[PDB]
Swiss-Prot record, chain A:
Domain of life: Eukaryota
Protein name, as recorded: Inhibin beta A chain
General function of this protein: Inhibins/activins are involved in regulating a number of diverse functions such as hypothalamic and pituitary hormone secretion, gonadal hormone secretion, germ cell development and maturation, erythroid differentiation, insulin secretion, nerve cell survival, embryonic axial development or bone growth, depending on their subunit composition. Activin A is a homodimer of INHBA that plays a role in several essential biological processes including embryonic development, stem cell maintenance and differentiation, haematopoiesis, cell proliferation and tissue fibrosis. Signals through type I (such as ACVR1B or ACVR1C) and type II receptors (such as ACVR2A, ACVR2B or BMPR2) which, upon ligand binding, phosphorylate SMAD2 and SMAD3 intracellular signaling mediators that form a complex with SMAD4, translocate to the nucleus and modulate gene expression.
Quaternary structure, from the entry: Dimeric, linked by one or more disulfide bonds. Inhibin A is a dimer of alpha/INHA and beta-A/INHBA. Activin A is a homodimer of beta-A/INHBA. Activin AB is a dimer of beta-A/INHBA and beta-B/INHBB. Interacts with FST and FSTL3; these interactions prevent activin A interaction to its type II receptor. Activin A interacts with ACVR2A. Activin A interacts with BMPR2. Inhibin A interacts with ACVR1; this interaction creates a non-signaling complex (NSC) that inhibits ACVR1-mediated BMP signaling. Inhibin A interacts with ACVR2A.
Subcellular location: Secreted
Gene giving rise to this polypeptide: INHBA
Gene source species: Homo sapiens
Disulfide bonds: C4-C12, C11-C81, C40-C113, C44-C115
Length: 116, 106
């Protein structure tokens, strides 16, 4: 998908460093103490609705069939710039009942952004 | 996720069945005849990433203070399909991102 840069005004990926100390979770997360999570931001005009950069899923093609024609169900749903692919991350943390756990947590890192 | 039931207002999955005959795609899609594609709908006042940006947003901190949270698919599933190629060749393929399985807020 698109990464943000000078003069890009549409849905794109930007960096975002999460520090667990900041949001107070360093009390139960041992490692990593912070990480690059990233996020998505930007406009989703109608000519990119439902896309993820250079690709259009089959589901989105079905939806855009109805949007293109103004068919009510989908004519009214607005397009949002959101992650369309995330990736897991290994973490070490205290769990309620288990104490110290090491485990891959899913949907930690935004990999690709797109318009809903 | 939740499934819409006409009473709940927060982000839920709506069932939606698509017939390829109705929308005029049955000239190149051989099977199945249609399927439940479903979609996402409802208010966003569950993934770890969304949770994390939730915290920051709540701290009235510029990055996410003004980023709208939207109801969107959080899981999609593939389907098997049979369709004609550009060569008018029948292909059996597992198409990905065909069915919305789960909805959640960004």
């Amino acid at each position: 998908g698109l990464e943000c840069d000078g003069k890009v005004n549409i849905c794109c990926k930007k960096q975002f460093f999460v520090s667990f100390k900041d949001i107070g979770w360093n009390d139960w997360i041992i490692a990593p103490s912070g990480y690059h999570a990233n996020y998505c931001e930007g406009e989703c005009p109608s000519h990119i609705a439902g896309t993820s950069g250079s690709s259009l899923s089959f589901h989105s093609t079905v939806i855009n069939h109805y949007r293109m024609r103004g068919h009510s169900p989908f004519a009214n749903l607005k397009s949002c710039c959101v992650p369309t692919k995330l990736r897991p991350m290994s973490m070490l943390y205290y769990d309620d009942g288990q104490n110290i756990i090491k485990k891959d947590i899913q949907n930690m890192i935004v990999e690709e952004c797109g318009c809903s």
